[PDB]
Amino acid sequence: TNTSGSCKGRCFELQEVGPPDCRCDNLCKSYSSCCHDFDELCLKTARGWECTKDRCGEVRNEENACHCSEDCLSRGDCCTNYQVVCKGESHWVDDDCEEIRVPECPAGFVRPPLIIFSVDGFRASYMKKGSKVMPNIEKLRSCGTHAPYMRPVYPTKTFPNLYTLATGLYPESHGIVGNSMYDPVFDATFHLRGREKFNHRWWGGQPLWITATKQGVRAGTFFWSVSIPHERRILTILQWLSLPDNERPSVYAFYSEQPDFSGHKYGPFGPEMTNPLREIDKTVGQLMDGLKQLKLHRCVNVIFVGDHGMEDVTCDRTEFLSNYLTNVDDITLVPGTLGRIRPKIPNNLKYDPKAIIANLTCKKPDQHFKPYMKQHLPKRLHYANNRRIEDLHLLVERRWHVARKPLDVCFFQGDHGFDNKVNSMQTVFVGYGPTFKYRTKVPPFENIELYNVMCDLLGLKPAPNNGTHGSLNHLLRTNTFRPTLPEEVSRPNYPGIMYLQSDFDLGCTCDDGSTEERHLLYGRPAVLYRTSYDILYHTDFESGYSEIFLMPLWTSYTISKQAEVSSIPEHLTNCVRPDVRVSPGFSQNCLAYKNDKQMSYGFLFPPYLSSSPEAKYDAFLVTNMVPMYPAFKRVWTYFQRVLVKKYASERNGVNVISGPIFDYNYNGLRDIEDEIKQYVEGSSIPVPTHYYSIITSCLDFTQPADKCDGPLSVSSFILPHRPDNDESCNSSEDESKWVEELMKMHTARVRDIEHLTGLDFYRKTSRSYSEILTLKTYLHTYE
Ligand SMILES: *[C@@H]1O[C@H](CO)[C@@H](O[C@@H]2O[C@H](CO)[C@@H](O[C@H]3O[C@H](CO[C@H]4O[C@H](CO)[C@@H](O)[C@H](O[C@H]5O[C@H](CO)[C@@H](O)[C@H](O)[C@@H]5O[C@H]5O[C@H](CO)[C@@H](O)[C@H](O)[C@@H]5O)[C@@H]4O)[C@@H](O)[C@H](O)[C@@H]3O)[C@H](O)[C@H]2NC(C)=O)[C@H](O)[C@H]1NC(C)=O
Ligand SMILES: *[C@@H]1O[C@H](CO)[C@@H](O[C@@H]2O[C@H](CO)[C@@H](O[C@H]3O[C@H](CO)[C@@H](O)[C@H](O)[C@@H]3O)[C@H](O)[C@H]2NC(C)=O)[C@H](O)[C@H]1NC(C)=O
Ligand SMILES: CCOC(=O)Cn1c(C)cc(=O)n2cc(-c3ccc(Cl)cc3)nc12
Ligand SMILES: [Ca+2]
Ligand SMILES: [Cl-]
Ligand SMILES: [Cl-]
Ligand SMILES: [K+]
Ligand code: NA
Ligand SMILES: [Zn+2]
Ligand SMILES: [Zn+2]
């Protein structure tokens, strides 16, 4: 009855067992529900974890933690060094590396098991301490498939990243948006400590262990109560792998709290870090020795993966909100390496976030954080579409903390949580086994991509997630996913001169094809929603004009290394010309811009780069026009006039695709018409929330962008369309002092832009679709 039951013959059972019965599984301690004898029967410790010479051929003592008796191999009970100490065998790490071309599994193994070896807080650069410190991990890394680093999700904390690993989802989608969270609909608080986190209402998406079970693939329990020592976790996985064919799981997970813990205490470059790193490598060696003893070391796929990195952060670098705000005791702050602010009393009517933000904006010249309303955060973070994410956010500068007041502040030297493009936040990925490539390095990738791959490694169909299935095919020897191009949903018109200048009264005054080959280098973008749009050709650019939103969905042009920048003549300053290809009812009008005292306009193709004086008149077409606040125009003009040509000079030409983005509900997805919330004054011209540019050139920078044979090179941005430059604390200075800094912060993946625009790029190339998918997930980080 309840606790008084026994774990005899049930240690680390994979049976689902619930109250009133007592449990003997991985997590029973965390639920305070183990049988009274779980500890003495299942957590055996006697004689340590390694065979000694005097133990070989012993008589089995069931009290020992692991065994060196003759029978132990057939029971899965051996210490992992048994054959080394007693049967003249070599440690796995001492064995020369050899390509595993196909799974070499014992009979009864239908497929290679997958083992996920997760390490908390393993900064990518720890890898550089090499075989001197971590010989087992180095053999995995050098013989298998490795990336130089893996990008975590924001915030770069444990619970958001490991649940992202398990689901393929951004935190805003799976719900674990922090290690601590307040849900205002539950009116409840999620914390690492305590019981609330065990409630299923917090956890969204479909994690890998559920996907597997629902598709008939058995998982071992991924989670381990903190009192189960690491050696016992390894022995338990190995004993599960010894199970009969009709019980043995196909996917396993080990977890280590190190080196996060020592990282927090000693900082990432403390000499104390060698010892946790050695201990982790020893655990890796115990696993691989155990797999060798099972004849499974050439049969199992092993993933060695971290959740985030670690930065130098000390008490001496703490910003205090009480230096900026008068009554900080009235707010609650999720503090440290990020900030989330809400009133201490939920729904307190006196809470004044616009006044708080004002007092936090550019108030010190060396200010070590920046306040954002969450819809203004860089889109690449994907950190806004969830009720658990406070409206007010603080992005904290690397190496610093933010706290409410000094009564809240030595004992720690490291921490993490920062912007997920910060180098110290990057973590590790190594794949080793029959399905991974041999001795292969792959570009860094994002942890959201791994759920699709683990599904591939298991024969599973992934639940809908934020990975791009196929962008990681290059990690794998086989079991690749064959991606298929999405189908165009709306086809374009190619209008000619259906009209004449007399048919147009839009209030606009002006004082005065084979383009596809040169300007549309990778095919036209496919439109993947139902809409109405026209292709418009020009000497210097091409565009896909939308009759519904009154502006191009995309504008595409190529700029050579040698092109010239030219001014706008003073008589063409206010020139806008009707487009005689496009109806008057499907055009913007300049009257609305004359009436709207806060809105101005800009051009997607820049007049500054037209090839000839004649060609420049195309740039002033009403169909090249987009609404832009004067504040944004300070950025956009500097981009068009200075930076595009600088990029062409540096990359040997560049192809540019630019356009608008509408995301008023900040969910990272293309708005439907009903969701657009702002229009030019007294008109129906919608106002974009962001503008994008995709800048492509030849990876081989010695070939011009327009004559490129092989792989491509891409960088992109999604700039916020804002009525002020408050985000840029140096914006009073010249644009050369702050615009590029702004753009670097809003770097983006082509894939981000695709979600936000409903468009599909790079459909016509001499490259495999898999390579293209990789290109679309690339993020240029400028670190
Ligand atoms: C990243 O990938 C994810 C997954 O593909 C994308 O998220 C999906 O987005 C679509 C489009 O809006 C949305 O579509 C349908 O939503 C509802 C049906 O919702 C219910 O059923 C589904 C199916 O089981 C379930 O996944 C949903 O879970 C969500 O809601 C619960 C309860 O609040 C949460 O516990 C859970 O964490 C999910 O929350 C996320 O999604 C909701 C939106 O549904 C957000 O409000 C929330 O803050 C959080 O972001 C739910 O139980 C249907 O009525 C509607 O008409 C659509 O057909 C999916 O629901 C959504 N799925 C998930 C898992 O988020 C996401 O767009 C991708 N991001 C980018 C940038 O590409
Ligand atoms: C934003 O920062 C403001 C400071 O830059 C801060 O203003 C300060 O608020 C207090 C009380 O609201 C003022 O009043 C106290 O001092 C003056 C004498 O100078 C008296 O007139 C008052 O009765 C009272 O004694 C401070 O003067 C004022 N400081 C300044 C420089 O104006 C705001 O409170 C901050 N806002 C938020 C939302 O935190
Ligand atoms: C899911 C929110 O974060 C954790 O639960 C952290 N964690 C802790 C504290 C103990 C533990 O044993 N595990 C194991 C995993 C895990 C995560 C993903 C995958 Cl794919 C495989 C394993 N994560 C944990
Ligand atoms: Ca949207
Ligand atoms: Cl957090
Ligand atoms: Cl909280
Ligand atoms: K105006
Ligand atoms: Na400013
Ligand atoms: Zn962690
Ligand atoms: Zn940590």
Whether residues 164 and 274 share a domain: the answer is yes
Instruction: Give, using CA atoms, the residue closest to atom 35 of ligand 1.
Output: 204
Burial (0-12, 13-18, 19+ Cβ within 10 Å), 103: middle
Residue 435 CB burial class (10 angstroms; 0-12, 13-18, ≥19): buried
**Domain around 548:** 531-777
Residue of 705, 715, 776 whose CA lies nearest to 518: 705
Same domain as 765, residue 709: yes
652: annotated binding-site residue?
Answer: no
Closest CA to 713 of 522, 452, 440, 449: 522
CATH number of the domain where residue 16 is located: 4.10.410.20
Query: How far apart, in whole angstroms, are the C-alpha atoms of residue 583 and residue 495?
Result: 10
Collapsed DSSP state (helix, strand, coil) of residue 235: helix
Residues 292, 333 within the same domain: no
End-of-domain residue from the set 395, 415, 435: 415
Q: How many independent structural domains does the chain possess?
A: 5
The response to whether residue 325 sits with its C-beta less than 6 Å from ligand 2 reads yes
Task: Considering every ligand atom shown, identify the ligand nearest to the alpha carbon of residue 689 and give its number.
Answer: 4
Binding residue per annotation — 663? yes
DSSP structural state of residue 493: B
Residue 734 assigned as binding residue:
no
- Is 627 contained in some domain? yes
Give, in degrees to the nearest 5, the angle at Cα 139 between 137 and 143.
125
Which residue carries 């994008």 as its tokens? 692
Closest residue by Cα to atom 1, ligand 3, is 163
CA of 204 to the centre of ligand 1 (A): 9
The helix (run of H) or strand (run of E) holding residue 533 is strand 533-537
User: Does residue 366 form part of some domain?
Assistant: yes
Question: Angle, nearest 10°, between helix axes 769-777 and 750-757?
Answer: 90
Q: Check whether residue 460 and residue 443 sit in a common domain.
A: yes
Which among 359, 363, 392, 404 is the best mutation to test ligand 2's pocket, defined by most ligand atoms within 8 Å of the CB?
A: 359
Does the annotation flag 307 for ligand binding?
yes
531 part of the active site: no
Q: Is 326 in the pocket of ligand 2 (CB under 6 A)?
A: yes
What is the Cα–Cα distance from 556 to 563, expressed in whole angstroms?
16
* 755 Cβ below 6 A of ligand 1: yes
Give the ligand 3 atom nearest the CA of 166: 20
Do 682 and 618 have their domain in common? yes
Cα-to-centroid distance, 173 and ligand 1 (Å):
6
Ligand nearest to the CA of 164: 3
Note whether 211 and 342 are same-domain residues.
no
| DSSP characters over 157-174 | SHHHHHHHHHHS--HHHH
Q: Distances in Å between the alpha carbon of 697 and those of 244, 351, 656, 706, 715?
A: 55, 49, 9, 8, 9
End residue of a domain, out of 457, 475, 493: 475
What's the 506 CA to ligand 7 centre distance in angstroms? 15
Which tokens belong to 314? 């000390």
**Residue 317 tokens, joined:** 């670098």
Q: CB of 174 closer than 6 A to ligand 1?
A: yes
Same domain, yes or no, for 373 and 461?
no
Experiment type: X-ray
283 and 376 co-located in one domain: no
C-alpha to C-alpha distance for 449 and 365, rounded to whole angstroms: 39
Half-sphere exposure of 365 (CA within 13 A, CB side): 0
Beta-carbon contacts of 153 under 8 Å, excluding residues fewer than 6 positions away, are 160, 161, 164, 170, 171, 382, 420, 446, 447, 448
Amino acid at 561: K
Using alpha carbons only, give the angle 151, 466, 334 rounded to the nearest 5 degrees: 60
The answer on whether 200 is annotated among ligand-binding residues is no
Q: What is the DSSP secondary structure assignment for residue 687, as one 8-state letter?
A: P
Q: Is position 94 within any domain?
A: no
Residues 168, 446: Cα–Cα separation, whole Å: 10
* Cα 319 to ligand 8 centroid, rounded to whole Å: 21
Nearest CA to ligand 2 atom 11: 326
Residue 350 near ligand 2, beta carbon < 6 Å: no
Contacts of 193 (CB under 8 A, 6+ apart): none
Pocket of ligand 1 contains residue 758 by CB under 6 Å:
no
Question: Which amino acid belongs to residue 565?
Answer: V
Tell me, yes or no, whether 606 lies in a domain.
yes
Q: Within the chain, how many helices (H) and strands (E) appear?
A: 20, 29
Residue bearing the CA closest to ligand 1, atom 61: 173
C-beta of 359 in contact with ligand 2 (< 6 A): yes
Query: Residue 689 is encoded by which pair of tokens?
Result: 């929330």
Ligand in closest contact with the CA of 593: 7
Count Cβ neighbours within 10 Å for each residue of 391-429 and write b for 16 or more, e otherwise. Answer: ebbbbbbbbbbbbbeeeeeeeebbbbbbbbbbebbbbbb
The CA distance from 381 to 403, in Å, is: 22
Measure CA 521 to chain center: 28
Ligand 3 atom index nearest CA of 209: 20
The helix (H) or strand (E) run that includes residue 718 is: strand 712-720
Q: Which of 720, 712, 783, 714 is nearest to 749 (CA)?
A: 714
Residue 114 assigned to a binding site:
no
Do residues 587 and 705 share a domain?
Answer: yes
Euclidean distance between CA atoms 228 and 7, whole angstroms: 16
655 is in an annotated binding site: no
Question: What tokens were used for 664?
Answer: 């008023």
Distance 44 CA to ligand 6 centre (A): 38
Residue with CA closest to ligand 1 atom 34:
204
Question: Which tokens sit at 663?
Answer: 């995301």
Residue 496 lies in a domain: no
Question: What are the CA-CA distances from residue 98 to residues 92, 117, 146, 148 (Å)?
Answer: 12, 21, 16, 22
Active-site residue (options: 145, 158, 757, 774): 158
H or E stretch at 119: strand 114-120
Of 398, 415, 432, the domain-final residue: 415
CATH number, residue 256: 3.40.720.10
Asked if 575 and 618 sit in the same domain, the reply is yes
The reply, when asked if residue 721 is annotated as ligand binding, is no
Among positive and negative, which fits the CA dihedral 220, 224, 225, 229? positive
Q: Is 459 left (phi over 0), alpha (psi -120 to 50) or beta?
A: left
The H or E element containing residue 774 is: helix 769-777
Q: How buried is residue 499: exposed, middle or buried, by Cβ count under 10 Å (0-12/13-18/19+)?
A: middle
Ligand 2 pocket check for 322: Cβ under 6 Å: no
Residues 570 and 644 both lie in one domain = yes
Q: How far is the CA of 190 from the centre of ligand 3 (A)?
A: 16
- Ion ligand 6 residue ranges (Cβ < 5 Å): 180, 182
Q: Which CATH number does the domain housing residue 632 bear?
A: 3.40.570.10
Write the CA distances from 292 to 146, 189, 250, integer angstroms: 22, 46, 17
Residues whose beta carbons lie less than 5 angstroms from ion ligand 9: 120-121, 158, 260, 307
Domain shared by 305 and 326, yes or no: no
Q: Is residue 464 within 6 Å of ligand 1 at its C-beta?
A: yes
Resolution (angstroms) stands at 2.0
The secondary structure element, H or E, covering residue 338 is strand 338-343
Q: What CATH number did the domain enclosing 332 receive? A: 3.30.1360.180
